[PDB]
Design an enzyme around this catalytic site. Structure first.
Site, short mmCIF file in Angstrom:
data_model
loop_
_atom_site.label_atom_id
_atom_site.label_comp_id
_atom_site.label_asym_id
_atom_site.label_seq_id
_atom_site.Cartn_x
_atom_site.Cartn_y
_atom_site.Cartn_z
N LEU A 34 0.93 -1.14 -0.11
CA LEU A 34 0.07 0.00 -0.12
C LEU A 34 0.95 1.37 0.11
CD1 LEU A 34 -3.10 0.75 0.32
CD2 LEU A 34 -2.71 0.89 2.70
N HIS A 35 0.78 2.30 -0.90
CA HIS A 35 1.67 3.21 -1.03
C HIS A 35 1.18 4.36 -1.77
CE1 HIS A 35 5.45 5.27 -1.79
NE2 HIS A 35 6.02 4.80 -0.79
#
Lengths: 359, 359
Positions: B201-202
């Protein structure tokens, strides 16, 4: 509002002079980056303000030429911070400037965009293609040009068919050549009769080939003895070589109706072109200029790199042949000189500057 | 017969490694020009021979970066005199190398040609376009890519649809990561159960937005309490920032079914991907790799920069939603893993080298 013109050659300076002249009659803040004689004298013959920036790129390899201008042009565009960078043509300068501007996020305009030889071997075709594809404003001379830019996925709203600035340029520079007593001196010191044909001959396919050369020379003679008309002949070193070689030169010195001259400058030669009765050439450039100048043109080749001049009636292709030549001369000397100009209406510098003002 | 590969980045090295590996099983004389860590260690993790030429371009302006490589790459290509220059991608190195080769009259090949964002603002799109238009061999990954190159007037016989070398690369590099006891060490020192979901997740649209982030975290929790399954979480600094900030991080440290790790390297992460049961991500890269690795993929966005993975069935778009998430997870855990690979058959390095052998 701020505009940067990147140029590196004389054909560039000429085609851009109408853009420069329009610019002096607008409130746009603009400048020239010239790359490399340090061309001062030329800019002055054309009544053109000196370039704010001259960058000597010096000589060195293709790679280093392009690299040194990438660096230098970059230092200028970082300092000047314009909104548009305008380039004309397809030299290494043009691609370098367009590349820098593109990386500095500056909009680029390509003057006379869309020409193609479809020979992606000469580095200049590539230059053309890259420069066009990094350009925000594509000032294409003809619809055909636009269609080229179009088959290359270039967005239609970036394309502006505005004719060629070579028309503006040739007209303006002619007027400038007329008011130049230093060159009017020269003109009057060669032209005798109010009637002359101006002849240029240079292509390898003509001067190397002893046959075609002999043929053409004799053609000129037939034309002379028929029409009893002076022929002026600007002669580059190579030709005089090939003529003393093929035993033809002496015959030319002989004929007292032929007047021979050392090669001359941009404006002198513009004078010689405007005031000719018809022009006889192998050069595509001279075909172009004659067509623009409303002077009938006869071309000593069988194919032409400016065929549109034949299409409008300004030009006829006789090649090697003396019958085609005699026949052409007959037609051209009685040619009502109002062909459509296939290169444009002669207002393209202004129009380009207007479109740039809009943006 | 003589072949020069110009590269400057790691995603480049990866996508080119199948071309390099094929090259070692041919009699072609070839070399690498690397531009700039001096990437030795990376070339060695991938069992790749060191680049003959490393050129430090150093840092400096866009203009000077491009110029210094134009000069340097030129000195090499003058010395080496290859027949083909091969480049992949769209960095300044790629355009520089392609430009030099083109001016030295060397044929250029573009690996993974034809991709377009049609956003001619990012300098990389331009790079792509220029490089494609100076290229002799266009190795396009998909038919769609070919059609792009085609709407740009690029001659059809220059285009070769040969799939993407990212497939070859991901497969090969996986095999290489498996035989690496230094990284098998690490893998075994995080994975407990023969079943885990790998989560990344970024994206800013997710971590900046306190809402979507809270949502997603809780989604993960629902997934956990339902399927009683370990989740491995490689976490870049930015995310941990946004999680301790939004009061969520502690909840994650809490949940003993969640296993959190410091970010890891190319091959470690390739290990983590291959041996996951399903993968949950916002990255287009990870979507790609999972699809190639035959691991089901759930994407926490509503739009995807690799939509083809959704088209073949490998990928499903749930975005922010916890119902879409639960539903997706249901489908993916019972997904017979044989989707068509939208990126290619996995033999593109070889095929590209064959086509280059022909020429």
């Amino acid at each position: 509002m701020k505009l940067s013109i990147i140029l590196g050659t004389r054909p560039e300076i000429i085609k851009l002079s109408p853009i420069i002249r329009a610019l002096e009659k607008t409130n746009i803040d603009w400048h020239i980056i010239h790359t490399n004689n340090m061309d001062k004298i030329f800019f002055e013959e054309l009544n053109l303000p000196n370039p704010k920036y001259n960058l000597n790129i010096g000589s060195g390899t293709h790679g280093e030429q392009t690299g040194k201008m990438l660096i230098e042009i970059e230092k200028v565009l970082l300092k000047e911070k314009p909104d548009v960078v305008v380039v004309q043509g397809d030299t290494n300068t043009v691609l370098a400037g367009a590349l820098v501007a593109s990386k500095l996020k500056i909009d680029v305009a390509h003057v006379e965009a869309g020409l193609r030889s479809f020979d992606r071997n000469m580095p200049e075709e590539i230059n053309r293609v890259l420069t066009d594809h990094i350009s925000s404003y594509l000032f294409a001379p003809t619809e055909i040009a636009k269609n080229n830019l179009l088959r290359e996925g270039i967005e239609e709203n970036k394309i502006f068919v505005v004719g060629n600035t070579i028309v503006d340029a040739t007209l303006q520079n002619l007027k400038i050549a007329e008011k130049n007593e230093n060159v009017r001196a020269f003109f009057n010191s060669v032209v005798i009769d109010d009637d002359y044909f101006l002849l240029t001959l240079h292509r390898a396919e003509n001067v190397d080939n002893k046959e075609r050369l002999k043929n053409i020379v004799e053609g000129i003679f037939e034309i002379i003895e028929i029409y009893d008309k002076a022929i002026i002949f600007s002669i580059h070193p190579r030709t005089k070589k090939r003529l003393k070689e093929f035993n033809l030169f002496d015959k030319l010195k002989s004929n007292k109706k032929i007047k021979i001259i050392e090669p001359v400058g941009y404006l002198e030669f513009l004078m010689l072109e405007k005031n000719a009765e018809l022009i006889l050439t192998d050069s595509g450039g001279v075909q172009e200029e004659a067509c623009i100048l409303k002077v009938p043109c006869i071309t000593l080749r069988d194919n032409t790199e400016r065929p549109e001049t034949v299409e409008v009636g300004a030009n006829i292709l006789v090649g090697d042949n003396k019958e085609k030549l005699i026949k052409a001369v007959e037609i051209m000397l009685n040619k009502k000189r109002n062909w459509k100009n296939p290169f444009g209406n002669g207002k393209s510098g202004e129009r380009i500057v207007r479109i740039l003002t809009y943006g």
